[PDB]
Enzyme design. Structure first.
Site, PDB file in Angstrom:
ATOM      1  CG  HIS B 151      -2.088  -0.865   1.383  1.00 56.49           C
ATOM      2  ND1 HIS B 151      -3.229  -0.672   0.417  1.00 56.49           N
ATOM      3  CD2 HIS B 151      -2.094  -2.063   1.714  1.00 56.49           C
ATOM      4  CE1 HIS B 151      -3.898  -1.743   0.483  1.00 56.49           C
ATOM      5  NE2 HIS B 151      -3.442  -2.548   1.281  1.00 56.49           N
TER       6      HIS B 151
HETATM    7 ZN   LIG Z   1      -4.200  -6.181   3.025  1.00 59.72          ZN
END
Ligand SMILES: [Zn+2]
Ligand SMILES: [Zn+2]
Ligand SMILES: [Zn+2]
Lengths: 25, 384, 31, 116, 93, 79, 32, 127
Positions: B151
């Site tokens: 992320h």
């Molecule tokens: Zn995740």
């Protein structure tokens, strides 16, 4: 049009027998 | 007429697909903790590793401690100011960096713990050394559970991820491989990795994620890449409670079509444990067999792969599925009876390897997944 | 100036005629 | 230069993260003076009152169940105490050429009552 | 624990059997309901019936109850015990 | 906050039964504190009595018993 | 051939059902 | 069991219109897959458009979420307020914003055929 030795049987019912049969199923 | 409802076949290894497995573990990774109330725990790495040692899996593989990344090597993807902030911020001098706290999204949902820079260095070094060992031919499978931070982005920290080590590993793979396929079976969308390689055809980023009002919100089916990277970012949106058979019948045709259409030279597999049933943040219904079937299926293609472990916020389930996946890469199936480790008290009440799925509604209907895979297959026709 | 954002009051038959006219124009100019 | 922090958030976007006839004032008031004076039912909704007792008894002893009749005894006693105190307050007000009970009117009553 | 949460639908077996029992109880003890089952008894016991018997049985069932009630055609086939239920509520009227 | 459960209209109802025609607005929050400290006196003694019977539950009998001590007897609940 | 050409619009209107969806359909056909 | 997401349980009180009692028939498949509570996997999720209330199945229009918060969900049948067309650069068109009745003029063309309206039109009944 006579259907001898029948195998398909029909039950006509209101909501009461239908709900009873649905609970059974 | 693309999706086929198939029952989950038992996991079987291929004896003709023996791979030299490299394991990257730094004993320090676990001594880092995001916070007191925080779901992400690096402690899941070493109970996964304690299951590797106590299963006797170290006799079929080589254990390496990767050199931690320096400041510049992190700047192969991230900016100088973000790495400079990450290497200098501590919980003590958090008030000295307030503009950078909101600039780089560090302080809330990505807290500042005093081993942040060392944890990121361990993760990035593990990913880059796994890719480097894959480049030189020293190993066929590189296993690094220290990373998985998919992320993290160029100048921000999101989703409990600070250093996007997967981008660094794919960068190190691209120096020797022309086409690198990234597969993300994490329940969240691999927004950092997909965003990093959105405009390039050299990296195909495939993500099998829940797409609702769920983090990170990115990952619509229409997101297929722009520029030269058009149709080179496959997004597979899934609903809640997908079981092993449904996930297998989604994963195997898509990855197979990518294999015979994109034809990659290296594979990066994000093994997020939050795709498992019973996860704190995940909403899928995968058992450990269902999670490991993706790793076993991608192992069958023979492409030099880098198995990198990502999410997973219940430590016991992610540790067990990582141990099973690691054992699967050595062409063995570990018995469902856990050996005695120092963290044996986690895996109650049966103390077995298996992660039991929940009995929740598999709301991913065959028609929806058929349409999803039909549009995905149609977009993949231009990747030859 | 309220005359700039005037909403055209059109009917269904005029839309039908315009759609038919413009598809016939496009088809035969490409032909 | 004095500064203060109010966002109280190290980072923004916390949500997007992974972790007509009308009576004159007083006539209705006197009407429901008559209504709540001719009546005998209990004016502080019960549940709320019971709770008041749980969170306040907790201090003296944990895990203290209360017989139902008890929290009804606490209610009765509390409503009797407050209606007596409020009669006195109205007096402590009608004393000072006024018709509006005010806090001061009850800090006094309680002083003369000697409950302070 | 025994079924790995696959037997969750059996958690209310007592309540569903109680409801089935109650439905049977009001099934015999209701006017315009027990004679429908009596007609079912006569239709099932007396086999070798043609079509015209089936329609007159249908209107004889219909005449027992109200004109706004719902009919159900619960078809049974000996071979295969396959019960097809059909909704003919206010359709044969 | 369970204290804020003693709502304004309820304090108004107590004033009405008490014959008050205009309640200041600052009264409502004074009546809470006075209420609390009083209940906090009975219930205290109610419990001393309770932990003398080695009972863990309190009784209405102990409540009217604590009232008798304080001075304000309550008829209608036993004893 | 001719009959389907002249009958296309109101048979499309019959298939649409709701008049608001047909209004938006005519808006689409006008925007084209 | 009851979540705003409407994915954690079988909820058949979403195929039934609240103010009419009829069944919300999906536009594309022309069916309502209510399910049976003995086979709840046979029930297809259905949502209604936030503008014209046209009910759509979650599979007929490809969607996984229910659009609980954020922007209002628009069904595919609505005409766009913004489109991009290729010049063969490009050209954009945006529909005019709604104007209150004191400052909005609706005018009827005299020319029926070929009147270049800006795409901003109103449909009148056909007599
Ligand atoms: Zn995740
Ligand atoms: Zn549909
Ligand atoms: Zn709509």
């Amino acid at each position: 049009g006579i259907i001898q030795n029948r195998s398909i049987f029909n039950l006509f019912a209101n909501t009461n027998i239908y709900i009873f049969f649905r609970h059974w199923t | 007429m693309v999706y086929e409802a198939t029952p989950f076949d038992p996991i079987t290894v291929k004896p003709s697909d023996k791979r030299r497995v490299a394991y990257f573990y730094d004993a320090d990774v676990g001594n880092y903790a995001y916070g007191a109330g925080h779901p992400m725990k690096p402690h899941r790495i070493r109970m996964a590793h304690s299951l590797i040692m106590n299963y006797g899996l170290y006799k079929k593989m080589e254990i390496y401690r990767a050199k931690p990344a320096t400041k510049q090597e992190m700047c192969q993807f991230h900016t100088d100011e973000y790495i400079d902030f990450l290497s200098r911020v501590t919980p003590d001098n958090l008030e000295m960096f307030k503009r950078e706290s909101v600039k780089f999204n560090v302080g809330d949902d990505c807290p500042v713990f005093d081993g942040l820079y060392e944890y990121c260095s361990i993760s990035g070094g593990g990913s880059m050394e796994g890719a480097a060992r894959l480049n030189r031919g020293k190993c066929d499978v590189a296993v690094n559970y220290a990373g998985g931070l998919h992320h993290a982005k160029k100048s921000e920290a999101s989703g409990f991820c600070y250093l996007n080590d997967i981008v660094l590993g794919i960068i190190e793979l691209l120096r020797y491989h022309p086409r690198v396929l990234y597969i993300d079976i994490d329940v969240h969308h691999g927004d950092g990795v997909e965003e990093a390689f959105y405009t390039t055809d050299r990296v195909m980023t495939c993500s099998f994620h829940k797409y609702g009002e769920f983090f990170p919100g990115t990952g619509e089916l229409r997101d297929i890449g722009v520029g030269a990277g058009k149709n080179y970012a496959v997004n597979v949106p899934l609903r809640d409670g997908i079981d092993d058979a449904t996930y297998r019948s989604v994963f195997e045709p898509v990855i197979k079509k990518i294999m015979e259409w994109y034809q990659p030279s290296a594979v990066v597999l994000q093994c997020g444990g939050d795709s498992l049933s019973g996860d704190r943040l995940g909403c899928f219904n995968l058992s450990m067999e269902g999670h490991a079937n993706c790793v076993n299926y991608v192992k069958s293609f023979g492409i030099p792969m880098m198995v990198v472990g990502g999410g997973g916020y219940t430590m016991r389930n992610v540790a067990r599925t990582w141990c099973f996946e690691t054992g699967l890469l050595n062409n063995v199936v570990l018995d469902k009876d856990l050996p005695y480790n120092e963290y044996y008290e986690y895996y109650g009440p049966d103390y077995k390897l298996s992660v039991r799925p929940s009995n929740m509604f598999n709301v991913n209907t065959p028609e929806y997944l058929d349409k999803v895979m039909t549009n995905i297959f149609a977009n993949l026709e231009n990747t030859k | 100036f309220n005359q700039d954002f005037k909403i055209t009051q059109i009917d269904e038959n005029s839309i039908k005629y315009d759609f038919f006219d413009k598809i016939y124009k496009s088809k035969m100019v490409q032909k | 230069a004095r500064t203060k922090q109010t966002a109280r958030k190290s980072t923004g976007g916390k949500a997007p993260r992974k972790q007509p006839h009308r009576y004159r004032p007083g006539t209705v008031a006197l009407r429901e003076i008559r209504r709540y004076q001719k009546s005998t039912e209990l004016l502080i909704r019960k549940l709320p009152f019971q709770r008041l007792v749980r969170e306040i008894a907790q201090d003296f002893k944990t895990d203290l169940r209360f017989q139902s009749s008890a929290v009804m005894a606490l209610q009765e006693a509390s409503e009797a105490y407050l209606v007596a105190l409020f009669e006195d307050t109205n007096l402590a007000a009608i004393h000072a050429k006024r018709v509006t009970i005010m806090p001061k009117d009850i800090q006094l009553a309680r002083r003369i009552r000697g409950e302070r | 624990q025994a079924y790995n949460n696959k037997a969750f639908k059996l958690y209310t077996i007592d309540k569903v059997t109680q409801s089935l029992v109650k439905h049977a109880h009001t099934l015999m003890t209701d006017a315009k309901t027990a004679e429908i089952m009596a007609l079912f008894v006569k239709d099932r016991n007396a086999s070798t019936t043609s079509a015209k018997d089936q329609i007159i049985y249908r209107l004889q069932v219909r005449s027992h109850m109200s004109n706004t009630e719902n009919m159900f055609r619960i078809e049974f086939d000996k071979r295969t015990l396959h019960v097809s239920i059909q909704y003919i509520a206010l359709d044969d009227l | 906050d369970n204290i804020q459960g003693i709502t304004k209209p309820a304090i108004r109802r107590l004033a009405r039964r008490g014959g008050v025609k205009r309640i200041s607005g600052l009264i409502y929050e004074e009546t809470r504190g006075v209420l609390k400290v009083f209940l906090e006196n009975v219930i205290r003694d109610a419990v001393t009595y309770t932990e003398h019977a080695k009972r863990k539950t309190v009784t209405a009998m102990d409540v009217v018993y604590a009232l008798k001590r304080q001075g304000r007897t309550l008829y209608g609940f036993g004893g | 051939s001719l009959n389907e050409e002249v009958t296309f619009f109101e048979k499309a209107k019959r298939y649409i059902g709701n008049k608001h969806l047909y209004t938006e359909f005519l808006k689409i056909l006008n925007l084209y | 069991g009851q979540s705003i997401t409407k994915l954690d349980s079988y909820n058949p009180d979403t195929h039934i219109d609240s103010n009419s009692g009829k069944f919300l028939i999906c536009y594309k498949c022309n069916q309502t897959r209510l399910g049976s509570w003995s086979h709840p996997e046979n029930s297809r999720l259905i949502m209604t458009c936030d503008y014209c209330q046209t009910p759509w199945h979650l599979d007929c229009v490809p969607r996984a979420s229910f659009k609980n918060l954020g922007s209002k969900w628009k069904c595919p049948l609505h005409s766009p307020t913004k489109v991009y067309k290729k010049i063969h650069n490009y050209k954009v068109w945006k529909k005019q914003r709604l104007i209150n009745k004191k400052n909005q003029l609706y005018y009827e063309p005299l020319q029926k055929i070929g009147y270049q309206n800006n795409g901003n039109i109103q449909i009148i009944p056909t007599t």
